[model samples]
Target: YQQRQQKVKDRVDARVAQAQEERGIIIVFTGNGKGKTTAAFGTAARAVGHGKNVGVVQFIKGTWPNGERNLLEPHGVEFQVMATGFTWETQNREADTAACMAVWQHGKRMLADPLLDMVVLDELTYMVAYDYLPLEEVISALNARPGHQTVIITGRGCHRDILDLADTVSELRPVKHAFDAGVKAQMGIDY
Candidate 1:
């Protein structure tokens, strides 16, 4: 009987490994770091490599240097730029909120598309944290998306409820940075 049980277990494991489109993953990258957007794009790259559709909406970073936009947009990836930088760079309260909602509208559309295999909401946490966008709406969009599509949100100050909904939540620990050494952000590495 033990031998039979072991064989059954092995068969189950083998079948699980063989199933490719079983489900997708939701990953949230939150913390104080420079790699949040970069890492999200990296996942987009991987998904694209596997012949999956990709969507990326950038919020709170349009004025700053965007190196990923230049590369990803030209390669058949659906992209949206919020055209609003950090709050310190923009003073219009209502405008900031409008811009976030506008970009989120595109993101919401992308989330509804069954053709898209992965969706990346870059810097979304900032919008949520600053109250420029409602958190419940974001959650509802994610929950209503097709079951096989993966989603990734990147930014700092992810809310507790948002963190709880994530299948994989990674907090980037900042032990040291080059800004402390009077060094500006490197062109390709930082921007």
Candidate 2:
């Protein structure tokens, strides 16, 4: 057992030594599951704790009270929840498109800013997937970000082009959810 443990430790040490490069990364969170936004916000909190400037732009998310938003606001994290409300309630497509475009303007600023260490484009996949925003425009902005700036995009059904450009892509698959089992979403936990 001792010999096996030593061998494992040695292998881990070798891999750690080889990974000497450090740079900002692009991460995508997509799939029919929960916790995508939670994971992104958790990382944002971690980054801010380390004294890094972070920006969060929630794309398709509606104007609902969120705990993460309230908590992060006090930490000097820039946040913009541009969504008016739920998609089902947003009956006017033209209005929605306009709103997304306006939000994109802000998103582009966050992406281009060199001082921001991290930016989370929350639920942006829906905007691209629904054709509310041009894929080319979004990709171009992402590709042009500062070298040391990290970005996290959260939503379902991310574009392949963006995925190819990303350094890391995490797809959350749902095995179970409380809402499916006739349980209503609770505040401070489900929001």
Candidate 3:
């Protein structure tokens, strides 16, 4: 047993050592699950801990008083949230599309900045899926970003083009949700 365990550990260590190159990565978090944004937020916090600069652009998660906003904004992560509630709730497609475009511009600026170590584009998939932003343009811009910069995009219905461009993509599947059980969105937990 000891010999087998040692062999397994050595093999894993060899693989880890083989991947020694460090470069910026494009990561996508998508699905119907509830933790996409939460996972990205945790990564932003992790990046901040590593003394890395981070910028965030929220596309469809309108101003509902995010917990991280109050916590991380005062720290270091720069955030620009441009959401006016969900589309069906707002009933204004044109306005929403415009807002998304403007917010993407802000995100583009951040992506172009070589100084930033990471940028989180929150709920961006909705914009692309809704045709609020040109998919190819966004992907091209992201691909052209500084070689040392990392980006994280979150939202459901992520396009295959974006996924193909990403270095890593995590799809969260909803096994069970509190909302389905009639639980309302809570303060610190949900929002």
Candidate 3, residues 13-43: lDDT per residue as tens digits?
9999999989999999999999999989999
Query: What tens digits encode model 2's per-residue C-alpha lDDT throughout 119-148?
Result: 999989988988888999989999899999
Model 1 gets an lDDT of 0.86
Instruction: For each candidate, give its TM-score against the true structure.
Output: 0.84, 0.93, 0.93
Per lDDT, the best of the predicted structures is 2
Model 3, residue pairs in steric clash: 62-83
10 residues in a row with least lDDT, candidate 3: 82-91
What does candidate 1's lDDT look like per residue over 55-106, in tens digits?
8888865676678887888889988888644353356778778878899899
Predictions ranked by lDDT, top down? 2, 3, 1
Best model number under TM-score: 2
Worst 10 residues of 1 by lDDT: 83-92
Candidate 2 positional error at 54, Å: 0.3
Q: What is the TM-score of candidate 3?
A: 0.93
Error of 1 at 22 (Å): 2.5
The lDDT of each candidate is 0.86, 0.89, 0.88
Candidate 1 deviant stretches above 4 angstroms: 1-21, 84-91
